[PDB]
Amino acid sequence: PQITLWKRPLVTIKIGGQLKEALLDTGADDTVIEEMSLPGRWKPKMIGGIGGFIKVRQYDQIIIEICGHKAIGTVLVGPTPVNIIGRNLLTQIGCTLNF
Amino acid sequence: PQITLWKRPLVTIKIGGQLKEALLDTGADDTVIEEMSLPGRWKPKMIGGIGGFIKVRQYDQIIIEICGHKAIGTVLVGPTPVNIIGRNLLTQIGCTLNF
Ligand SMILES: CCCC[C@H](NC(=O)[C@H](C)NC(=O)[C@H](CCC(=O)O)NC(=O)[C@H](Cc1ccccc1)NC[C@H](CC(C)C)NC(=O)[C@@H](NC(=O)[C@@H](N)CCCNC(N)=[NH2+])C(C)C)C(N)=O
Numbered sequence: 653p654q655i656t657l658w659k660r661p662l663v664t665i666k667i668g669g670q671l672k673e674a675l676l677d678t679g680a681d682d683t684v685i686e687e688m689s690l691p692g693r694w695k696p697k698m699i700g701g702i703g704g705f706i707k708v709r710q711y712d713q714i715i716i717e718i719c720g721h722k723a724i725g726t727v728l729v730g731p732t733p734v735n736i737i738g739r740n741l742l743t744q745i746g747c748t749l750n751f
Numbered sequence: 752p753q754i755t756l757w758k759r760p761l762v763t764i765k766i767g768g769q770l771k772e773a774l775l776d777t778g779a780d781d782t783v784i785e786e787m788s789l790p791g792r793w794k795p796k797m798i799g800g801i802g803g804f805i806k807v808r809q810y811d812q813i814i815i816e817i818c819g820h821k822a823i824g825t826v827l828v829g830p831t832p833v834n835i836i837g838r839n840l841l842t843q844i845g846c847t848l849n850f
Pocket residue numbers: 675677679680681682683684699700701702733734736738774776778779780781782783797798799800801802827832833835837
């Protein structure tokens with residue numbers, strides 16, 4: 653794909669068993685996913701942004717298969733307004749930004 | 752340039768005759784610059800992000816150059832952790848997400 657930026661870069665990813673719509677965020681270091689009880693162990697972590705920080709649990713080694721490109725990595729789970737796909741996973745499906 | 756995401760996509764921008772780093776952000780609808788003196792007439796605004804809302808002075812149709820390309824549009828100025836180039840400008844310098 654060659655996605656254009658006219659609209660927001662939304663896609664459908666696949667976490668655990670559920671399919672969801674996340675935002676390809678080039679300005680997100682980590683991936684933060686809306687609350688969902690992924691089994692596994694976890695740890696407490698704070699993430700910030702425009703406006704402040706929110707608390708989230710870290711999940712490591714999660715498989716997410718963003719539109720047929722499966723990546724596997726660390727996903728943060730918490731009360732985020734948008735499922736966010738960040739660079740720790742965009743780099744894995746070989747996403748580049750070209751102008 | 753074809754920018755890869757193993758590192759944060761920082762790029763140099765000349766805004767108001769000043770050079771400054773800015774992150775290229777596909778998850779931002781607009782462009783927010785840290786506090787600065789831009790000529791023109793500002794109209795207060797509120798934008799929110801992964802933290803919450805912030806107050807930002809709004810400048811309309813500002814000429815800015817991102818890595819030599821030029822853009823002229825809206826630039827919000829306020830208490831942002833890092834400057835950011837969002838979609839309203841990314842599309843002016845023909846930027847796309849590729850993978
Ligand atoms: C077109 C106008 C219509 C509406 C318009 N838009 C908005 O209100 C929208 C929703 N806000 C946004 O678009 C804002 C950018 C601000 C803006 O747009 O002005 N985008 C955002 O805030 C997006 C996430 C998001 C996406 C969509 C919706 C909501 C949130 N995050 C951008 C942000 C940039 C980065 C440099 C800090 N990244 C993050 O928040 C990520 N966090 C990180 O990268 C952390 N490691 C940073 C720690 C904090 N400290 C620090 N950075 N110094 C997080 C996703 C893990 C408006 N006028 O306000």
